[PDB]
């Protein structure tokens, strides 16, 4: 069983140079991400190795969806978990304007325009978490089954909460390819920051950047 009420509870439970501040917030949220995942139905029941695989595979997308939704009422910028607001101009002045603008135009603005709610956000993150294509999974079919239960619950929720919007479910799912692309580009940047060594990178963030 995959009740949307439980997913919502998981979201509510974890709610609290420019690049250096952004990376600091990322490290901080990685700890919170683990607590979030444990609250998602059936995640803690999967074998430990698979739990590790799913988190290492989706942490970028999971964190991006979270700060993007948290920034829906912010104009031309994002709100970091540390409480700091980062404006588009600041990101541009730091050399990461292109990827920052993609987050604003492809995610933040779209979430705002459709008024994506916390339940929907939680379900999309749960779908991202339960990625059956993650390499190394001991039982990909089990993870696929969990993903299917999540999107079945999400579709039911959308039709009941927003009956006047027949395309809302599809619209929500169609933000996932953009999230995937942005997450990959973000990872590339992080690898570069690590390579250059000019940006402080905390221990957990650093660990996520280590080889499998």
């Amino acid at each position: 069983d995959m009740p949307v009420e439980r997913i919502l509870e998981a979201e509510l439970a974890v709610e609290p140079d420019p690049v250096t501040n952004i990376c600091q917030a990322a490290d901080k949220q990685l700890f919170t991400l683990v607590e979030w995942a444990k609250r998602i139905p059936h995640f803690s029941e999967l074998p430990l190795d698979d739990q590790v695989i799913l988190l290492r595979a989706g942490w970028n997308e999971l964190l991006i969806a979270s700060f993007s939704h948290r920034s829906i009422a912010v104009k031309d910028g994002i709100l970091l978990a540390t409480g700091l607001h980062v404006h588009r101009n600041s990101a541009h002045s730091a050399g990461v304007g292109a990827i920052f603008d993609r987050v604003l135009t492809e995610l933040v603005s779209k979430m705002r325009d459709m008024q994506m709610d916390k339940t929907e956000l939680g379900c999309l993150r749960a779908i991202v978490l339960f990625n059956p294509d993650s390499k190394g999974l001991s039982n990909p079919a089990e993870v696929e089954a969990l993903r299917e239960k999540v999107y079945a619950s999400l579709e039911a929720y959308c039709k009941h909460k927003y009956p006047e919007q027949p395309g809302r479910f599809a619209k929500l799912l169609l933000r996932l390819p953009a999230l995937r692309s942005i997450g990959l580009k973000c990872l590339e940047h992080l690898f570069f920051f690590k390579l250059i060594g000019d940006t402080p990178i905390d221990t957990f963030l650093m660990e996520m950047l280590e080889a499998p």
Binding site: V34, V52, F204, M208, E210, P212
Partner: peptide, 11 residues
């Protein structure tokens, strides 16, 4: 490997 992550998932 994945030292921190394993410890945190320990619960």
């Amino acid at each position: 490997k994945h030292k921190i992550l394993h410890r945190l998932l320990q619960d």
